[PDB]
Nucleic acid binder design. Structure first.
Lengths: 511, 701, 249
RNA sequence: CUCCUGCU
RNA sequence: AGCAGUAGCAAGGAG
């Protein structure tokens, strides 16, 4: 019972991995059984104190909270897979039987006349014009014959790459040659870009109401008792009745329907190229309608692991002049004219190649779960307010309470716009949806470090005299992870403007 | 007009505007390619933190050994982290530790630990994560690798009759004494292996990349051990688990209130308190297991004789573990056309085809490389001792130097909150530099970039930001609301269970619960292709519901997965949908749904929609089809033993003789008992008896 | 006459060659690690493959003989219900589930299923007969306790329950005779008068015993009185910034 | 030329 | 081409 199997090799093993002033495990155990401490410990402690050279840094005397270094370089392009602000859509009344996406593609082929969709072979700008021209003609006659299977030509064999991968040769045969096929490896890292200036306009556009009403297909309300279900149902009715009108809901339903259709077509047809519409579904004058924003082309995904990076080709419908700064990765073509009754303005066809992935589908196709942090935030505001007042003041608190947002452009010093609380939850669903779009590594590390600087600002707000030990490596770690993601650079700029606004009352910062 | 969300913080707290700063709605970061450079960074940086060059030759392993205790080359750059522990200092802190609470402390907790060791059955090993099967050199779940290990035991010499923990451990050491071990490879041949290769293979730990972690820019490598290292680590984690449960300065919301409220009562007329949130960096590369061997030689300097020898093996196996090197790298020509793959075996011969960073990492790891692995001797990787370094944290936070200026606080895995009590700010420099001194001596490196402090409670602990009065709550994982995907009945109520348990523990204000409830309803209906009857959906499942709806009398008794609306609410998240619709169903509908005679259920909620989809098709098309033959034979034998013992899934079937002999003894037992009070027939008793005798002669042959 | 069938199955499974090296070589406990051979890694996205399954036309494996005893090949407009691709098990679609649920025969089993889930019907019965009041909107909070949360009337402690089902359902290899038997053996004399003749299988009976007798004690943040009547309604009664209770009886 | 995949 | 982010995918395997 009380005997362990004393082996032969392990007793030579445990005697080998003892500390250096010991010979065997037995001598180490006999010293550890009879160990009594002393007060030469303090001599080793103070002897560790003397050779340290480390001082803390206060903030009331050396408030070196300098603003971050935005890279002053070429402006970061528009890197979202679709178009948010610059869209144009064709409408029709929605038919209940004609509901599948290829049926929607055909019904919008007769509805929006593609016979007048004549493009010159010369783009305004871009890189490859002939390939997208013959691709658009080939898919236009392909939708004309009402069958979604692109016949193999050199254009699709060039764009959605077939045969464009390296020959992975294992090290069983190598057939070496004298100074020929000299092979090695090389990595670079990431490219650095600058501050985008267009992101304010898509922010203010994306939180503005659009006359088409509801966009997100939510579900029905459960029945309520005489309990607090009147409260939660009331908050769902008011908040849901606010978020259904903005363009953020149109983008979320666009991602759900479009990436849902490309997702099920990535399941059902590997190895075959489809033609998938880019659309929505929303209510217009009571009559439920559907949209049509663009045309997507799949790239014969054989999704082995969660990655795989299949090719998506997006033909887009715009009605604005292009931009070689913002719309830089695009290959802007044209279309013609559209009658827009407020006269018959222009219509531009855009082109873009891009890629999606299998892990980058289920976080986009299930992006409806963004009403949790917004309603959590507004609900913690209201519940903390009535928790500090101890009186049922909810419905009148949702109108007579201000929220400071959106300082102006020319001046910033205490010049803010106090808005109502439902416009605050508009901006909250905007910033949560922008979090759900642009998630990379850089946003994660920058959210960590802005949690630290937010802790410093809260340490400023109540005069607590915060302090840090080493600020050089701190700004070395923050400026490492601000490279090319536009949301991260934009939030860094707005964090600097947060310090500029907060510098007017508290004293822990710079100009 | 510009716009800035962070202006919400101009007149608020950070207990309300902090859920705004978690990017949990997006995709998590994934790794790509091999996981070689991360492992070489971990081991190479671990030896770079060694602060020594003293090598000791080995006779067991053909590579050198560098020690990590009491051999310090004190460079002047002491702000850089060190990986050297002084043993008299930490044993002095242990003797100082037990003198604060009780006298017979370690004997008490260690006797309770051994009181829970000897009553443990080793099926507890199968309730774990993925491990490293050394038979085929892969990653397998725990019961598979344990079954292949016991298969190597009963294939090599004799059989196994242990059915405990300690006899299995002695069986592992008995495998270490063996000169030759036979096992099976792939189509199932049987090979043999020597003695030194078995020693090199039992100490093999696999490395990989940590996938899906929120909070870092650079990726980090996690390592999984084999099977023969796990149960000793389970013993140590039960011991230190009882020690951490007994201690009072370890972790989560009440203890900070008791220590802040109590240490505000220990203030004189001129003293004050300053708290500091820190973050101990490089925690997995500065905990050498030799100090675990010495301190566990203290806690088992006074336990017994068996526990004294059994709690001193897993630190040795962490002292001479190997490290798997991923699967190599890739090379390509100037035209970027052909790309050869070099594995971890031929990395030595093809050394001259690498980058500058790779050759910088590789030439400082060359004198420790084996053929496939590397030799690490002081590292403590992820997937290892977690509740034992916390004891070192409490030992740093219970120091007594003798004024009346001192510190206290709270410790976690690598997160700590420290409270100092002093009189002036240069004395604060003295005490905090004493804290960096004692942590720096013991082997705990605080990072200077990620630390701060104030006077009141405004601190940070395990992503809970405590302000002066109010409490921040943990930002939960959003995909955890929908994780089942198994049934039309065990997904919605599972989501209500997740909303319930996230409502009780966290705050989770009710409108968020109603909103996420209706959203999880919407993804349920969108997943299982079922819509309500009044909707305009016309697919292959709503036409049947649309045509036959006139037969149903009361419309709101239909299930959600059959075309009914929602009746659950916040105040009924603990009750499934089926009962609250069973109080209203039509009798043809209730008698029609709840028939157990259905082709779907035959071949926790009410299982009336439980169907089994078809499996994948690489189960008979790969080279591992014989493994599917093994799972089919195992399901047949388990259905045989389940067919004899009518109630076997309730109690764990202990016993150490055999299965088929207990089967034959049970059929003879019920044959005699059901004979004499029952059957009585000569052809049946002699015929069943004839089948038992012929099956026993068939099994013995 | 079941022992003859089990003898046929036992001789049939000892007839195999390489299965002789499977049994009488391992132990009784090894059955547990003979149960788990799930060579799938983690199934880290089950809902993804569930949506991939339900999006196809025939994802489901179902029995043939009952559905060919009662079902119809196709519905009235193009709805497929049957396959002939592969033992005799037939792949179908989820339309056959709801088609059984609206156009299938019925077997009267209402009282049995209303007797299986008596704990949850007790929960709904206690929920339907309660009354509420106004809210308060005040601060609240108290520490975490280990609370038994079910209105049971026996209050065993997760140890006499497994032993109880051993000494109720199958006593031939039940347990070593302890000192915890006698009054629970009077309870054996009461309980064998209930589960003797039923159509319910033994696994479902062993399931339903352990939910009428077990006070489920968990470590939860509680406040106020610690009566187990209001502990399953813990998530409803109060949150962090609000509180509601006006129950008279 | 065919077959097979869809976490191995 | 492109997706990328410290190294991968842009199909692969067998007969």
């Amino acid at each position: 019972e009380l005997e362990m199997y004393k082996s032969k090799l392990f007793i030579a093993m445990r005697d080998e991995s003892v500390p250096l002033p010991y010979i065997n495990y037995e001598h180490l155990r006999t010293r550890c059984e009879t160990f009594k401490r002393n007060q030469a410990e303090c001599e080793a402690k103070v002897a560790d104190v003397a050779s340290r050279l480390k001082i803390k840094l206060e903030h009331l005397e050396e408030n070196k909270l300098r603003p971050l270094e935005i890279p002053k370089e070429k402006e970061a392009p528009y890197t979202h897979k679709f178009l948010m602000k610059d869209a144009w859509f064709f409408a029709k009344p929605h038919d209940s039987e004609r509901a599948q996406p290829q049926q929607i593609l055909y019904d919008f082929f007769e509805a929006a006349n593609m016979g007048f969709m004549t493009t010159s072979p010369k783009p305004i700008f871009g890189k490859q014009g002939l390939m997208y021209h013959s691709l658009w003609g080939q898919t236009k006659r392909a939708i004309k014959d009402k069958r979604n299977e692109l016949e193999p030509s050199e254009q699709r064999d060039f764009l959605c790459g077939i045969g464009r991968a390296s020959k992975k040769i294992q090290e069983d045969k190598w057939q070496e040659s004298r100074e020929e096929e000299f092979k090695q490896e090389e990595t670079k890292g990431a490219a650095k870009r600058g501050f985008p200036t267009w992101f304010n306009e898509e922010w203010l556009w994306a939180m503005r109401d659009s006359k088409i009403g509801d966009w997100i297909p939510m579900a029905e309300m459960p029945p309520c008792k005489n309990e607090m279900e009147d409260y939660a149902k009331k908050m769902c009715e008011e908040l849901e009745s606010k978020i259904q009108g903005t363009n953020c809901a149109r983008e979320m339903s666009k991602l759900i329907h479009t990436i849902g259709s490309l997702h099920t077509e990535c399941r059902n047809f590997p190895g075959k190229v489809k033609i998938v519409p880019i659309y929505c579904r929303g209510t217009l004058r009571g009559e439920s309608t559907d949209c049509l924003f663009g045309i997507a082309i799949k790239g014969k995904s054989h999704l082995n692991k969660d990655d795989g990076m299949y090719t998506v080709v997006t033909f887009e419908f715009s009605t604005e002049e292009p931009n070689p700064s913002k719309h830089e990765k695009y290959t802007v073509f044209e279309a013609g004219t559209v009658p827009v009754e407020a006269k018959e303005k222009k219509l531009f066809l855009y082109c873009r190649t891009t890629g999606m992935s299998k892990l980058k589908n289920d976080w986009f196709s299930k992006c409806r779960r963004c009403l949790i942090p917004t309603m959590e935030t507004v609900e913690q505001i209201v519940l903390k307010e009535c928790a500090l007042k101890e009186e049922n003041r909810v419905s009148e608190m949702l109108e007579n309470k201000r929220a400071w947002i959106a300082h102006e452009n020319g001046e910033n010093l205490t010049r803010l716009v106090s808005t109502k609380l439902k416009d605050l939850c508009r901006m909250l669903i905007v910033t949560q949806f922008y979090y759900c779009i642009y998630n990379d590594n850089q946003l994660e590390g920058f959210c960590n470090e802005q949690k630290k600087f937010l802790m410093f600002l809260q340490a400023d707000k109540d005069s607590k005299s915060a302090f840090t030990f080493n600020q050089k490596g701190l700004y070395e770690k923050i400026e490492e992870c601000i490279v090319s993601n536009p949301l991260c650079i934009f939030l860094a700029d707005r964090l600097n403007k947060l310090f500029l606004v907060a510098k007017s009352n508290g004293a822990k910062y710079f100009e | 007009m510009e716009i800035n969300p962070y202006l919400l913080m101009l007149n608020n707290d950070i207990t309300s505007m902090i859920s705004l700063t978690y990017p949990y709605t997006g995709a998590p970061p994934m790794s790509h390619g091999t996981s070689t450079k991360y492992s070489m960074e971990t081991v190479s940086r671990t030896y770079s933190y060694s602060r020594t060059k003293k090598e000791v030759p080995s006779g067991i392993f053909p590579i050198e050994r560098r020690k990590f205790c009491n051999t310090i080359e004190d460079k002047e750059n002491l702000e850089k982290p060190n990986g050297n522990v002084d043993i008299n200092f930490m044993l002095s802190l242990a003797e100082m530790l037990e003198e604060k609470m009780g006298k017979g402390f370690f004997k008490f907790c260690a006797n309770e630990a051994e009181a829970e060791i000897l009553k443990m059955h080793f099926s507890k090993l199968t309730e774990g994560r993925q491990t490293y099967d050394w038979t085929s050199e892969r990653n397998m779940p725990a019961a598979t690798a344990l079954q292949l290990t016991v298969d190597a035991i009963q294939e090599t010499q004799g059989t196994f009759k242990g059915t405990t923990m300690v006899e299995y451990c002695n069986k592992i050491l008995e495998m270490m004494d063996w000169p030759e071990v036979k096992f099976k490879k792939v189509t199932l041949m049987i090979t043999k292996i020597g003695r030194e290769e078995f020693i090199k293979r039992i100490c093999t730990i696999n490395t990989m990349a940590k996938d899906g972690e929120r909070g870092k820019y650079k990726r980090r490598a996690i390592a999984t051990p084999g099977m023969g290292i796990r149960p000793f680590s389970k013993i140590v984690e039960t011991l230190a688990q009882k020690i951490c449960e007994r201690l009072a300065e370890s972790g989560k919301k009440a203890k900070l209130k008791t220590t802040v409220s109590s240490t505000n009562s220990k203030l004189q007329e001129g003293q004050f308190m300053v708290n500091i949130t820190g973050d101990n960096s490089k925690w997995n590369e500065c905990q050498q297991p030799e100090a675990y061997l010495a301190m566990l030689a203290y806690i088992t300097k006074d336990s017994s004789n068996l526990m004294k020898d059994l709690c001193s093996v897993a630190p040795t196996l962490f002292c001479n573990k190997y490290v798997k090197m991923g699967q190599g790298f890739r090379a390509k020509n100037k035209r970027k056309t052909k790309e050869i793959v070099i594995p971890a075996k031929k990395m030595k011969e093809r050394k001259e085809l690498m980058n500058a960073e790779w050759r910088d990492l590789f030439e400082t790891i060359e004198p420790y490389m084996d053929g496939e692995c590397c030799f690490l001797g002081g590292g403590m990787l992820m997937g290892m001792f977690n509740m034992l370094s916390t004891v070192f944290g409490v030992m740093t936070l219970n120091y007594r130097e003798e004024r009346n200026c001192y510190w206290t606080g709270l410790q976690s895995s690598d997160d700590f909150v420290l409270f100092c009590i002093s009189r002036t700010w240069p004395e604060m420099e003295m005490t905090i530099l004493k804290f960096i001194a004692v942590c720096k001596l013991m082997g705990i490196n605080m990072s200077l970039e990620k630390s701060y402090g104030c006077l009141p409670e405004l601190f940070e602990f395990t992503s809970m930001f405590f302000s002066g009065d109010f409490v921040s709550n943990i930002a939960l994982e959003l995909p955890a609301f929908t994780t089942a995907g198994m049934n039309e009945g065990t997904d919605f109520t599972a989501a209500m269970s997740v909303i319930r348990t996230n409502m009780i523990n966290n705050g989770l204000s009710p409108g968020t619960a109603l909103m996420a409830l209706r959203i999880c309803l919407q993804e349920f209906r969108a997943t299982y292709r079922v819509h309500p009857y009044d909707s305009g959906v016309k697919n292959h499942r709503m036409k049947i519901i649309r045509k036959f709806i006139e037969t149903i009398e009361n419309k709101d008794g239909l299930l959600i997965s059959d075309g009914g609306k929602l009746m659950n609410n916040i105040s009924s998240l603990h009750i499934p949908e089926e009962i609250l619709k069973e109080d209203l169903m039509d009798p043809s509908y209730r008698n029609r749904v709840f028939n157990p005679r259905n082709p779907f259920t035959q071949f926790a909620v009410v299982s009336t929609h439980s169907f089994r989809t078809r499996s994948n098709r690489t189960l008979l098309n790969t080279d591992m089809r014989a493994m599917a033959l093994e799972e089919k034979r195992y399901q047949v034998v388990c259905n045989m033993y389940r067919s004899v013992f009518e109630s076997a899934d309730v109690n764990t079937p202990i016993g150490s003789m055999s299965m088929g002999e207990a089967i034959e003894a049970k059929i003879l037992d019920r044959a005699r008992t059901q004979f004499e009070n029952g059957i009585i027939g000569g052809e049946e008793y002699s015929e069943i008896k004839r089948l038992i005798e012929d099956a026993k002669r068939q099994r013995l042959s | 006459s079941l022992l003859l069938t089990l003898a046929k199955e036992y001789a049939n499974l000892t007839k195999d060659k390489k299965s002789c090296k499977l049994l009488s070589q391992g132990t009784v406990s090894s059955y547990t690690t003979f149960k788990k051979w799930t060579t799938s890694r983690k199934e880290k996205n089950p809902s993804l493959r569930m949506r991939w399954a339900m999006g196809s036309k025939f994802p489901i494996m179902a029995n043939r003989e009952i559905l060919e005893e009662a079902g119809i090949p196709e519905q009235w407009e193009g709805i497929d219900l049957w396959s002939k691709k592969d033992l005799g098990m037939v792949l179908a679609s989820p339309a056959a589930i709801t088609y059984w649920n609206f156009c299938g025969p019925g077997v009267d089993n209402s009282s049995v299923i209303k007797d299986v889930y008596k704990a949850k019907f007790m929960k709904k019965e206690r929920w339907r007969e309660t009354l509420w009041g106004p809210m308060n909107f005040e601060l609240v909070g108290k520490q975490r306790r280990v609370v038994e949360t079910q209105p049971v009337e026996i209050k065993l402690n997760q140890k006499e329950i497994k032993e109880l089902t051993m000494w109720v359902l199958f006593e031939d290899e039940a347990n070593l005779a302890s000192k915890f038997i006698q009054e629970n053996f009077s309870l054996v004399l009461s309980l064998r008068e209930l589960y003797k003749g039923k159509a319910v299988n033994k696994d479902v009976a062993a399931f339903m015993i352990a939910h009428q007798f077990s006070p489920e004690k968990r470590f939860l943040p509680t406040f106020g009185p610690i009566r187990p009547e209001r502990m399953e309604l813990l998530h409803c009664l109060g949150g962090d910034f609000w509180k509601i209770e006006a129950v008279t009886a």
